Design an enzyme around this catalytic site. Structure first.
Site: not given
Length: 320
Positions: A239, A290, A293, A299
């Site tokens: 990541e 997303e 999240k 996030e």
């Protein structure tokens, strides 16, 4: 030669797996990572030629640690039916398990889960094709500056020694989640330009030139592995990314800068200063914004693409 992405699925409005395959092909994304088993996804990727990392979910570690039969079942259900048509290369057994409060409950399952998954691959005759590791957060690193002085925190040394020996014995890589974004956000004395790969004075450390924070962080991990007697374990960056909203420096511009520059850096022959000369296998976090999240707004803004597959910002995914 081709960039990777994390195919994060924690949104309520994402594309079909087949559309995602097409999006990766269109953008020369050649590797992808999922955080858990997903038959529909692995089926959709059949014959795509895209290399795949499949995770054991943290909540699934206890089952596979506690029984070889369970670990065999996991491989037989989630990996064996899809290989070789889907080009699975690694099992990432757990994600950010060590030195993470939310995952402290899983720590005792990590090493036996890694070993049992390996045995399960061997039982399935997949051991020549698929290797086993686990993705670590940078919270495992104690000292990181200068990079030559990198160490693991005392509290993880036992676990890490076991993991590194396993990796050496199996020719498997250390998997690291590495975010200049978070290092910068938490220490504003770091130069933002250094975090972003923008022009900035290089940091010279034992004759090696650090032009950016990513290389400094990665090399702190290499030094930490060397400090435990393991100089020849490669690193895969499972990541790295930069959020595009939710903080002063989480902006379209900065996310565009970071991810474009990271891709250009890792696909090149630069390497890192301790290991120069070859490309760095990297999975951008993440393919999509997303929307489930959280709790922090950043996030929900780690995507290269919005859920409708429109770019959040323009990205050059190749060296061409």
């Amino acid at each position: 030669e081709q960039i990777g992405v994390n195919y994060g699925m924690d949104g309520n409005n994402l594309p079909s797996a087949g559309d995602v395959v097409s999006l990766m092909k269109k953008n020369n994304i050649g590797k992808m990572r999922i955080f858990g088993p997903n038959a529909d996804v692995l089926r959709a990727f059949a014959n795509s030629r895209i290399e795949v990392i499949v995770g054991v979910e943290n909540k699934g570690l206890e089952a596979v640690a506690s029984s070889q039969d369970s670990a065999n079942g996991w491989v037989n259900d989630n990996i064996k039916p899809f290989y070789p048509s889907t080009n699975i290369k690694y099992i990432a057994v757990g994600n950010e398990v060590l030195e993470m409060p939310d995952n402290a409950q899983y720590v005792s399952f990590l090493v036996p889960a890694i070993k049992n998954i390996q045995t399960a691959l061997e039982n399935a005759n997949l051991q020549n094709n698929i290797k086993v590791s686990t993705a670590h957060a940078m919270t495992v690193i104690g000292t990181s500056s200068p990079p030559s002085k990198g160490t693991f925190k005392d509290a993880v040394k036992d676990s890490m020694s076991s993991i590194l020996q396993f990796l050496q014995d199996h020719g498997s890589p250390f998997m690291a989640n590495v975010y200049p974004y978070f290092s910068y956000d938490g220490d504003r004395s770091i130069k933002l330009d250094y975090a972003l790969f923008n022009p900035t004075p290089p940091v010279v450390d034992e004759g090696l030139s650090y032009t950016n924070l990513f290389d400094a962080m990665v090399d702190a991990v290499l030094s930490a592995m060397e400090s435990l007697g393991h100089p020849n374990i490669p690193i895969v960056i499972t990541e790295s990314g930069w959020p595009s909203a939710g903080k002063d420096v989480a902006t379209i511009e900065n996310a565009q800068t970071y991810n474009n520059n990271l891709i250009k850096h890792v696909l090149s022959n630069a390497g890192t200063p301790k290991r120069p000369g070859s490309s760095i296998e990297t999975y951008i976090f993440a393919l999509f914004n997303e929307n489930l999240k959280g709790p922090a707004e950043v996030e929900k803004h780690f995507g290269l693409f919005n859920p409708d597959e429109q770019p959040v910002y323009p990205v050059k995914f190749s060296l061409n």
